[PDB]
Amino acid sequence: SPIDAAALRASVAAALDPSTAVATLARFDTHAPRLLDALSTLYGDHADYVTWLPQWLSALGVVAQARPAALRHLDDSRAPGWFGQQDMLGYSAYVDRFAGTLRGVAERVPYLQELGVRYLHLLPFLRARAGDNDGGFAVSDYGQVEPALGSNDDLVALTARLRAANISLCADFVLNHTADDHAWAQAARAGDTRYLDYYHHFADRNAPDQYDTTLVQVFPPGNFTWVDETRQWMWTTFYPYQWDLNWSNPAVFGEMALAMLELANLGVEAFRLDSTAYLWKRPGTNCMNQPEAHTILVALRAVADIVAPSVVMKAEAIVPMAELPPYFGSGVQRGHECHLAYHSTLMAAGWSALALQRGDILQDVIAHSPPLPPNCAWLSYVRCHDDIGWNVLQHEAAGTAAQPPFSLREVAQFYANAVPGSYARGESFQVHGTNGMSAALVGVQAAHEHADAAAAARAVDRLVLLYAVSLAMPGVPLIYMGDELALPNDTAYLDDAQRRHEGRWLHRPAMAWELAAQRHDASTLAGTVYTRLRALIRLRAGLPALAATQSLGSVALGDARLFALTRGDSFLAVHNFSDVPLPVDLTQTGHALWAVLDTDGTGDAPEPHTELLLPAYGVRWLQRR
C-alpha cells in the first residue's frame, strides 16, 4: 500500500534535506497520526484518496524544505501560547487605508511599534476579482499580493521589517470560496473537469432546489448561480462571483493546505480563517457548522503543527461565545484546532453596557465566558471593519431570574441616533447591525456638533473605558485602525457611485497621518486618547497576571452600574459604566489593601486602598502586592 504509515513518512522525508529535516520529521511523528486520522475520516473512501495522499505529502515536504531560515527560527524558538502573553497587543487595518501599499505599511512600522503593537492584522490584500470583489474577500490567487497594493517581494520585505519590530502579521485565508476568476475557476470554465470538481456543480436545478429548502440565505439572492460558460449551477453562498470550494474533494484540502504554508513562508504568522461554518455541505441540513468543518480545521492545524509550528490559527466566526468552544477542538482534538477566536459577545456587551449604563451585563458575560484550553485565547475588540452585530447578545438580552433583560433594538437605535438626545452618531446597517467609528459612537462627533468641550471629554472617557475592558482580557486585544486617535466617521463614500451602496464605508476611513502626528500633544483629541490608551497598554505589558494562562473571573458588585473582573489572583479591574461617581468597598470582596495602579498617567503612587471612588465612566486597575 502506497499509503502505509511508513510510506507516508517517506513521502515527506523524500523532499527534505537530511541535515535540516530532524526537527520537521520529529514534529511529523508527533502530529501525523492526528492529521492522518482526520484525512481518513474526511476523505478515506473518496475515489482519489489513495492516489492523492502520498504525492500531496511529498508536496508538503517540498514546501517545508523551502521554509526560510528566519521563519524556521521562529518555529524553533516560539513557545506554545506565545500569542497570549501580556505584551501582546493587536491592530487591524486595511493596507490601502493605513498606508497605501505594503511598502507604505513597512514605513509606518515605528508608529505601530511605539503604540506597542505585536500583532498586526492587514485586511484582505491578496489578488482579488477584477471589478466587484466583496471588499477583497473574493480571492483570485491565495499566493499573490494584489498588484495595486504591492508585490510578493514587498510582502517578504514587510514581514522582515515586522519581525525586527517583534510584530506578527495576521492575514485572512478565505477558506470557503474563491473568486470566479481564480485559476481553478478558470480551468473549470475551460472545461477541465478536474478543476470543475474543485467546486460544487450541478447539471440541473434538482439538487439545488432541494438544498434551497434547508439553506439560509446570507444576502436575501440565492445559494446557486447558473454559469453559462460551464452550463452548470455552481454553489454560491455569498456573491454570485464567489464559488464555494468543494471540501469533500481531498485535492481541495491539499491545495488549500499548501496555499496556507506558502503564505506562512512569505512571513504570515497568523491566519484568520474565514467562513469556516460553511466548509461542509450535507444534504438535508443548513450546511453550516457540520462536524466535518471542525475536522478540516483540525487537519489544517496539524499541517501547521508539522511544517510551521510558530503559526497561529484564528477562527473568524462572529457568533455568540457559547458557540466558540468547538473551535478550540473537541475530545482528543481539544487544544489541536484554533488557537484564537473572537470575543464578539464581550464586544457587543461593552456597547450595550455603555448605552444602558449597566455594568451587570458585562459581569454576566465574564461569569459565563467559556474556559480557554491550553494554548488558546481570545481576540478582544471594540470595533472592526464590519458593523456591530448585536445578535451575538441575543441570549443575554433575554435575561434570567437573577439578570434583568435588555432591549437590543433599544441599544441599536441609541447608537443610530434614532432617539432624541443621544450622543451617538452611528448608522443602522441596511435587529440590524450598527455602522460607525468608536469615536462617533461614544459622543465625540455630537460633542463637536454642539461645540461642547465637557461633552467631548466625557466621550473620550467612554472610549478609553471600552478599550480598558478589552485590554484586561486573556489573549490579543485588537485596536481598530485610528481608534487610538479617535478617528471620526467617513461620509465621503456617499458621493462615490461605486461605494455608496455599502454603508460599512462609514467606519473604514483612511489613516490621517496629520492627526497621528498629534498623538503626544495632550491638548488635542488625538493626543488625549492616544496617551490614555498607552498608559493602559504599558501597564498591561508589565502584568503577568494578564497573560492568557491566568484565570479570568468576575466579581458581582451590589450596583448594576459597576463591573469588576479579576485576572489570576493578583489583579482586579473595576469599572463604572454610568455618569455618576460611585464608591466601592474593597473589603467586601477580599481586595482590601490592594494597590491602585497609575492607569491615568499620574496620581501618583501606587498605594494600598480599602475603598475606591470611581468617577463617571471610570476605570481602576489594582494589584495585589
Side-chain angles (χ1 to χ4, degrees):
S1 175
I3 70 171
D4 300 343
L8 296 183
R9 189 193 197 266
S11 305
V12 174
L16 300 170
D17 170 13
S19 54
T20 58
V22 178
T24 297
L25 292 179
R27 294 192 302 253
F28 177 94
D29 294 334
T30 298
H31 299 292
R34 197 172 69 257
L35 167 60
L36 299 171
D37 171 78
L39 294 181
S40 182
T41 296
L42 289 167
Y43 307 119
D45 297 312
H46 190 275
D48 296 333
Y49 187 67
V50 180
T51 55
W52 165 79
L53 179 56
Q55 64 85 37
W56 170 72
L57 287 169
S58 291
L60 175 145
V62 168
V63 182
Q65 177 62 39
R67 189 140 174 81
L71 296 168
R72 296 200 184 202
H73 172 258
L74 290 186
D75 291 346
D76 293 340
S77 67
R78 282 224 203 274
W82 64 272
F83 50 89
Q85 291 296 105
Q86 66 270 22
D87 62 339
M88 295 292 291
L89 173 73
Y91 196 83
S92 178
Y94 286 102
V95 172
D96 70 307
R97 308 307 259 168
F98 186 62
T101 62
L102 291 187
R103 282 187 172 199
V105 175
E107 290 165 357
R108 301 291 182 176
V109 162
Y111 177 87
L112 297 171
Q113 188 171 36
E114 173 186 328
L115 173 54
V117 174
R118 282 203 49 215
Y119 183 99
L120 169 68
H121 173 213
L122 297 173
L123 287 148
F125 59 83
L126 293 173
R127 190 164 63 77
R129 185 177 176 269
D132 295 337
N133 59 38
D134 187 21
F137 285 90
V139 177
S140 311
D141 193 340
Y142 296 106
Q144 185 200 350
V145 175
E146 178 74 68
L149 298 179
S151 66
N152 283 21
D153 282 0
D154 294 338
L155 179 61
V156 173
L158 163 61
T159 61
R161 181 70 193 86
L162 285 176
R163 287 190 300 276
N166 211 23
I167 301 185
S168 300
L169 175 64
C170 174
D172 288 88
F173 189 30
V174 176
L175 285 179
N176 181 245
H177 51 268
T178 69
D180 63 0
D181 70 339
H182 191 283
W184 304 329
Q186 290 178 335
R189 298 169 78 107
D192 190 342
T193 61
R194 166 191 179 185
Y195 293 102
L196 185 64
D197 291 342
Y198 275 31
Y199 301 93
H200 288 279
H201 59 89
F202 308 87
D204 57 40
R205 278 298 308 197
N206 205 100
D209 278 358
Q210 285 310 291
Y211 270 124
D212 282 340
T213 71
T214 58
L215 293 181
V216 177
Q217 311 192 59
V218 169
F219 299 125
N223 297 112
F224 298 90
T225 299
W226 170 260
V227 177
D228 290 311
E229 194 165 7
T230 67
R231 294 180 78 77
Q232 303 258 348
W233 291 90
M234 310 300 302
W235 200 309
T236 59
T237 296
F238 303 97
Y239 288 94
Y241 52 74
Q242 288 162 309
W243 292 6
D244 291 46
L245 281 167
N246 188 352
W247 282 89
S248 78
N249 181 352
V252 163
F253 178 92
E255 290 264 26
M256 297 292 279
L258 297 179
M260 182 183 74
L261 297 175
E262 293 177 335
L263 281 165
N265 275 1
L266 297 171
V268 175
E269 296 191 26
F271 296 90
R272 189 172 180 255
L273 305 168
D274 299 324
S275 288
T276 55
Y278 300 89
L279 301 183
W280 197 263
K281 326 304 190 189
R282 169 167 277 104
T285 68
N286 64 9
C287 301
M288 292 180 65
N289 298 298
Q290 301 299 115
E292 290 82 2
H294 289 286
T295 304
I296 291 160
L297 295 187
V298 162
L300 295 174
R301 166 64 177 276
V303 164
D305 286 331
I306 295 165
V307 175
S310 58
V311 162
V312 169
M313 302 289 146
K314 176 170 60 183
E316 168 230 48
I318 305 300
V319 295
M321 61 181 187
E323 299 171 25
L324 258 13
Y327 285 97
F328 295 135
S330 315
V332 289
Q333 319 292 10
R334 191 162 171 286
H336 301 293
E337 202 178 310
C338 299
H339 297 94
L340 292 169
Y342 287 72
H343 209 315
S344 299
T345 290
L346 175 68
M347 183 277 302
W351 289 109
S352 297
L354 189 66
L356 305 169
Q357 300 187 46
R358 280 183 58 190
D360 63 345
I361 294 175
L362 287 163
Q363 192 278 331
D364 178 60
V365 164
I366 300 300
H368 301 99
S369 283
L372 293 167
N375 300 323
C376 297
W378 301 114
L379 289 298
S380 299
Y381 67 109
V382 169
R383 288 291 290 109
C384 65
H385 61 288
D386 278 343
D387 53 310
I388 303 171
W390 303 106
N391 72 299
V392 299
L393 212 47
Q394 204 156 317
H395 170 70
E396 286 83 359
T400 55
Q403 276 300 116
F406 51 100
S407 164
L408 295 172
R409 291 179 197 272
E410 181 194 345
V411 171
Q413 271 199 320
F414 178 83
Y415 288 110
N417 192 24
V419 172
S422 174
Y423 57 64
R425 298 289 186 271
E427 300 177 351
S428 185
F429 189 60
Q430 280 172 298
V431 53
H432 291 21
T434 303
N435 297 321
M437 296 286 288
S438 290
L441 292 163
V442 296
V444 178
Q445 187 182 311
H448 290 163
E449 287 169 0
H450 295 127
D452 191 335
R458 287 190 297 280
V460 172
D461 294 340
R462 296 179 192 110
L463 179 55
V464 173
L465 170 63
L466 294 175
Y467 269 102
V469 172
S470 306
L471 287 161
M473 291 290 288
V476 182
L478 192 58
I479 297 170
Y480 185 49
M481 189 211 80
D483 275 3
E484 76 282 9
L485 313 170
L487 276 196
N489 284 347
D490 182 11
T491 60
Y493 81 97
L494 292 180
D495 300 330
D496 185 309
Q498 188 171 193
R499 293 186 306 156
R500 69 187 173 207
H501 63 106
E502 178 50 75
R504 291 172 282 182
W505 285 110
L506 190 70
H507 51 78
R508 300 168 176 186
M511 174 59 105
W513 289 102
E514 86 277 12
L515 294 178
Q518 292 170 13
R519 70 192 177 270
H520 305 294
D521 188 341
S523 78
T524 68
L525 173 59
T528 298
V529 172
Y530 182 97
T531 300
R532 291 173 69 178
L533 291 180
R534 271 299 298 159
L536 295 169
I537 298 164
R538 179 181 323 116
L539 285 177
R540 170 179 159 84
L543 291 164
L546 269 50
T549 51
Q550 306 298 120
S551 65
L552 166 62
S554 76
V555 176
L557 305 171
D559 196 314
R561 291 168 291 188
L562 301 170
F563 165 51
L565 76 79
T566 59
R567 298 300 317 289
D569 295 317
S570 62
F571 173 93
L572 164 72
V574 187
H575 313 74
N576 183 0
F577 273 78
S578 73
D579 57 14
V580 180
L582 293 176
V584 175
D585 187 348
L586 297 178
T587 82
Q588 288 197 324
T589 58
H591 298 100
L593 287 190
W594 283 33
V596 176
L597 303 179
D598 188 24
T599 46
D600 289 334
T602 281
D604 197 333
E607 276 190 15
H609 285 236
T610 44
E611 59 283 317
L612 307 154
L613 178 43
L614 289 87
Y617 302 118
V619 183
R620 292 290 182 273
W621 279 10
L622 295 88
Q623 188 177 23
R624 180 190 71 180
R625 294 185 166 181

